[PDB]
Amino acid sequence: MEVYRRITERVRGALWAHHGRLMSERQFHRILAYVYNNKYEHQIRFDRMEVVGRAWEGRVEVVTTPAGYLKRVRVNPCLEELSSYRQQQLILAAYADACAQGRRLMEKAEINIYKQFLKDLKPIVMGIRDNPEFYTVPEDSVETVGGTLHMGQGPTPTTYRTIPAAKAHIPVDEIRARQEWEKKWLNSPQGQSWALTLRGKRYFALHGPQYRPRGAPGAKKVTMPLDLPAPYTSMDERRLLKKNWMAYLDNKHVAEVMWTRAKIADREKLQRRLQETGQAWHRPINKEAVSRW
């Protein structure tokens, strides 16, 4: 849905406006289809489980599936006599309470969706961003035909830098060292003994891929995290320019319109943020930020 449509539209515009690379829409939709099947695979087992709501004091017991399918209604016979209307509104309130509960779990699992899909789009933005050639400017800088002028307001920002100025440090290195610490451990005194302890067998199981027999589902071996160094990988524009320039122009044109509209999004989210915390005004008063150009 549009959370992940917004997210990947802004990532598309990123991997293009931050590097001359284009994401193949084959991929752009393999991403959204993986989120949609995330939700189908949640909804599947969500439909094998129940939420129970109950109306006043628990007289009406509505049994439901978290998606909101009313399955059963055990009633107190002091309710059969209310009316036809008030029976309706009471079972409806019991349904509504159960729906509140099921949707509580539904939103407790949509955050798991956010988080698996995030672990998913990690190595892609980490690809575009955790490379020596990744740099921005301050959003206030009057970017001029030849570079970026300066800001005037709120002097001295704090330019971060996410990358070690030292030699390269990559997650594959970190994970290989992770297994090496794991190795030295399962060699060490507390290592070999904790491994024979439940705390060790539990870890082995819940995290040992190379131990899945021939047949079991899941990762059947250990995987390094993914590496997509954008500014050092022409992604698609190579294939597009080779085959046909028409598709090239339009694919880059979309990626650019997408980043443009995610910019318009940041702009209007900021616009409300200011009209909220008292920075801006509800109708143009400061024209010279548009009329002096």
Binding site: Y40, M49, E50, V73, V75, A109, G218, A219, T223
Partner: protein, 148 residues
Amino acid sequence: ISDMVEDAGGLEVVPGLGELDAKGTPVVPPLQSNAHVPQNVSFYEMARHPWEDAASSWRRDGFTEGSLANYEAQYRAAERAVYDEEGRGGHNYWPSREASEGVTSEEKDAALLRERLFKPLEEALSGVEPWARNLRRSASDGKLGYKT
């Protein structure tokens, strides 16, 4: 809702649901839910990568085994001969014409082939009948005087 109930089997009127007993407990134990957050339904450990096990939603048209073994291997050989040519353990950025533009001497690979692929064949063909060896011979040569 009235028809959700109908397809839900009508209201089952069970007497005394939320009615409490003298000792403060309810008669007719309530209905109890079995719902939580599913803890093993990340779709990625499912629709994984086909040949490796990097379970995510990114396409990476890999390279065949063999055409990566030999490929990267002879790249290592070519780099060890271009950049570190005199074998002193030092990478000389300025090798000669002959080092920069000499193809590596790993054409011993086809010689290994010539020993362990074609040679046992060349012993095995001591059992073929001559007319066929000569026929496939002249055929692979292109000199076949078939009298029209």
